[PDB]
Design an enzyme around this catalytic site. Structure first.
Site, PDB file in Angstrom:
ATOM      1  N   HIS A  41     -11.933   0.701  12.465  1.00  0.00           N
ATOM      2  CA  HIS A  41     -13.135   0.852  12.389  1.00  0.00           C
ATOM      3  C   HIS A  41     -14.386   1.071  11.781  1.00  0.00           C
ATOM      4  CE1 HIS A  41     -11.622   5.292  11.046  1.00  0.00           C
ATOM      5  NE2 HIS A  41     -13.355   5.631  10.797  1.00  0.00           N
ATOM      6  N   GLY A 143     -15.921  10.831   5.913  1.00  0.00           N
ATOM      7  CA  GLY A 143     -16.272  10.008   4.712  1.00  0.00           C
ATOM      8  C   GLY A 143     -14.391   9.636   4.351  1.00  0.00           C
ATOM      9  N   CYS A 145     -11.535   8.795   5.691  1.00  0.00           N
ATOM     10  CA  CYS A 145     -10.467   7.264   6.316  1.00  0.00           C
ATOM     11  C   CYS A 145     -10.177   6.792   5.334  1.00  0.00           C
ATOM     12  CB  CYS A 145     -11.657   7.447   7.533  1.00  0.00           C
ATOM     13  SG  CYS A 145     -11.204   8.698   8.423  1.00  0.00           S
TER      14      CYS A 145
END
Ligand SMILES: *[C@H](O)[C@H](C[C@@H]1CCNC1=O)NC(=O)[C@H](CC(C)(C)C)NC(=O)[C@@H](NC(=O)OCc1ccccc1)C(C)C
Ligand SMILES: *[C@H](O)[C@H](C[C@@H]1CCNC1=O)NC(=O)[C@H](CC(C)(C)C)NC(=O)[C@@H](NC(=O)OCc1ccccc1)C(C)C
Lengths: 306, 306
Positions: A41, A143, A145
Site C-alpha cells: 500500500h 509511519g 508500516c
C-alpha cells in the site's frame, strides 16, 4: 533470577531497515541481499486507500517512482514486483549487512520481537505474541508500516511479521514476509474487526513455571486434575484448549521444578475460580499469556546468540 | 496506538560486547576505543569473594592473565587499571564499532535498556527502572555480570549501568560506568539487603496519561485535589512525594490530553483508595511505575534514533 519481557537483540535487523517513499507515502522497508521488501500500500494515496486494485496501481508505477533511502545513501530501484500484500523492489546494491535469514510463518500463541521503525530508523524493540485471533497487541504510530517482527536462532534471523494496519480496538494486523496476512484481514480501508480473542493456556502454564523457578509458589496446591476436567474449566474462562502435546512441551519445565503439568493445571484452575486475592505473580496481578515454554527456558537458562 | 515496555534498539551496544576471562571467572566487558570495561571482581576466585582486597589482588595480576575475546578474535591486553569497582583493560586495538557515547549516572525513577549478555554474546534486551532504593528488577543469571544498561539520544549512547550482583530478594545491584555503585551495596559476598522500596509517583501519573492517550479513561473523574492533599495520600500508600517540578515535567502530557496534572492526581488517589475493581489499565491490573514522562512521549509520539 528475575523474569522480564525480553526481546531479541535487534542489531541484525537494524542493519536491514530502509526508508521507502513513493508519491505521498513514506514507510519502512526490509533490505536483504538486493531486494527491499515493503507493504504494497505504499503505491497508494489517501483515496486509492478506500478500495484499491493494487495490480492496476502497480503497472502504472515506474522504477524511478520508488525512492529507497538506506540512511543517507540512496538505492536505485532496478525492478519491482508484487508478492501478495508485499512489494519486492530490486535494487542494484546488495546489503552488505544481510544476516543469515529465513522467512517463517508463526502460529497463534508464538512470540516474536518487533523492531518499531519510522522513516527507516529503528525507534524501539519489544516482545509480542500472535494472538489466537491473528492480531498482535503492538505499539505502532503512523509511519510504522513495514516494521518487522522476528526471532533469532543462534545466528539466523527468522522474519515472521511485517506491519500493515491498526484495527479499531487498538490492535494490529500484518503479514508474513511472503505477503500473506495473518488472519482474515485485508489491506483496505474498509470496516474490519478483530474477532473474539482467547487466552493462550499453554503460555500461562509456562509463566507459572517461570514463577516457581523464581520463588513465587503461593499459588501451588496439593490437588490435581485430569486433562479433561481441566479443559472444561478453561472453556468457561475463555482459555484455549490444552492438548496432550502442550503437556509434552511443558515436560522440561515440569522436570526442572518437580511439579507435574497436571498439578500446575489444578493451580491454574483455582487461580481462575478464585482470583489472585490481591497477590501478584512475577510482579503481575493478571495471568500472563505472552511467554511460551521456550521463552521461559531461554530466560531461565541463559541462551545467547551470535 | 498501543503501549508496550519498549527498549532502545541494541545494535550500537551489541558491537561493544566482549568476553573477559581471568583465572576461573568469565564475564562480559564493554569495549570502547582501546579500553575494555568490566567488573573488578573478575580478578577473584570463589574464596577471594568472601571479603577481598582488590587493590592487593590486582597488583598480583599480569596483563597476560586477562583473556579478552571479541567474538572469535582475541584482544591483547597491554595495560590494566582499576577505577572504583570496574577494571579498565587497555587493549592494542580500538573498537571500529565504537559509537558516540557518554558515561552518565542516572537518578532513581529513571529508566534504561539492559542488554543481557553471557560470554560476550547478547541474549536479550529489556527495559528497567532504577528503583528508589537503588536496585533494579532485572533478569540476570550467572555469567551476566558486565552487561550494561543504557539510553540512546539520537546517535549517542549514554551508558548508565554495569551489572555486578543479585541481592537475596531477586533484585539486582550494579555501578555506573565509572565504577561507583548505585546505592549502599559493595561487591562482596557479605550479608546485604535492598532496603524498603517505594512507588515512583511521577511515573505512575505518566502511565495514566499514556492510558488516556490510548483510550483508557474509566479511572478519570470530575474531582480535583491540592498538591498537599495528594501528598498525604501518597505517604500512606508508600508512594514517593510528588513535587511541583514533577508537575512541570507532566505539563506536556497534561496539555496533549486536556487533563490538569492535579486532576490526574485525584484519579490516582481514588485508584489508591478504591483499587481497580477488577478492571485493567493498558492491560495491567496494577499501577505501573516504570515509564517516565519521557518514555510516554517517545512512544506516543514516535521518536527515532540514528
Ligand atoms: C502504516 O504506517 C499504517 C500503520 C498504522 C497507522 C496507525 N497505527 C498503525 O499501525 N497503516 C495504515 O495507515 C493503514 C493503511 C491501509 C488500510 C493498510 C491502507 N490504515 C490503518 O491502519 C487504519 N485501519 C483501517 O483502515 O482498517 C480498519 C477499519 C475499521 C473500521 C473502519 C475503517 C477501517 C487505521 C484507522 C489507521
Ligand atoms: C556475575 O556474573 C554475577 C551475577 C549474579 C549471578 C546470579 N544473578 C546475578 O545477577 N554476580 C555474582 O556472582 C556476585 C559476585 C560478587 C558478590 C559481586 C563477588 N554474587 C552475587 O550476586 C551473590 N550476591 C551476594 O553475594 O550478595 C548478597 C548476599 C546476601 C546474603 C548473604 C550473602 C550475600 C548472589 C548470591 C549470586
Amino acid at each position: 533470577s528475575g523474569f522480564r519481557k525480553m526481546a531479541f537483540p535487534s542489531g541484525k535487523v537494524e542493519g536491514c531497515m530502509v526508508q521507502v517513499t513513493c508519491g505521498t507515502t513514506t514507510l519502512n522497508g526490509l533490505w536483504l541481499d538486493d531486494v527491499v521488501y515493503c507493504p504494497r500500500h505504499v503505491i497508494c494515496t489517501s483515496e486509492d486507500m478506500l478500495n484499491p486494485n493494487y495490480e492496476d496501481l502497480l503497472i502504472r508505477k515506474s522504477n524511478h517512482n520508488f525512492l529507497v533511502q538506506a540512511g543517507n545513501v540512496q538505492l536505485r530501484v532496478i525492478g519491482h514486483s508484487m508478492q501478495n500484500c508485499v512489494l519486492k523492489l530490486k535494487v542494484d546494491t546488495a546489503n552488505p549487512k544481510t544476516p543469515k535469514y529465513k522467512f517463517v510463518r508463526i502460529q497463534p500463541g508464538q512470540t516474536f520481537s518487533v523492531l518499531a521503525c519510522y522513516n527507516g530508523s529503528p525507534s524501539g524493540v519489544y516482545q509480542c505474541a500472535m494472538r489466537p485471533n491473528f492480531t498482535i497487541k503492538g505499539s505502532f504510530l503512523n509511519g510504522s508500516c513495514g516494521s518487522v517482527g522476528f526471532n533469532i536462532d543462534y545466528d539466523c534471523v527468522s522474519f515472521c511479521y511485517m506491519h500493515h494496519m491498526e484495527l479499531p480496538t487498538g490492535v494490529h494486523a500484518g503479514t508474513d514476509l511472503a505477503g500473506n496476512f495473518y488472519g482474515p484481514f485485508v489491506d483496505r480501508q474498509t470496516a474490519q474487526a478483530a474477532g473474539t480473542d482467547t487466552t493462550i493456556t499453554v503460555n500461562v502454564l509456562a509463566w507459572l513455571y517461570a514463577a516457581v523457578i523464581n520463588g513465587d509458589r503461593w499459588f501451588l496446591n496439593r490437588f490435581t486434575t485430569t486433562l479433561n476436567d481441566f479443559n472444561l474449566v478453561a472453556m468457561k474462562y475463555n482459555y484455549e484448549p490444552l492438548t496432550q502435546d502442550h503437556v509434552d512441551i511443558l515436560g522440561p519445565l515440569s522436570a526442572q521444578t518437580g511439579i507435574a503439568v497436571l498439578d500446575m493445571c489444578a493451580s491454574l484452575k483455582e487461580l481462575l475460580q478464585n482470583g489472585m486475592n490481591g497477590r501478584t505473580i512475577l510482579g503481575s496481578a493478571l495471568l500472563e499469556d505472552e511467554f511460551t515454554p521456550f521463552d521461559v527456558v531461554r530466560q531461565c537458562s541463559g541462551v545467547t546468540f551470535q
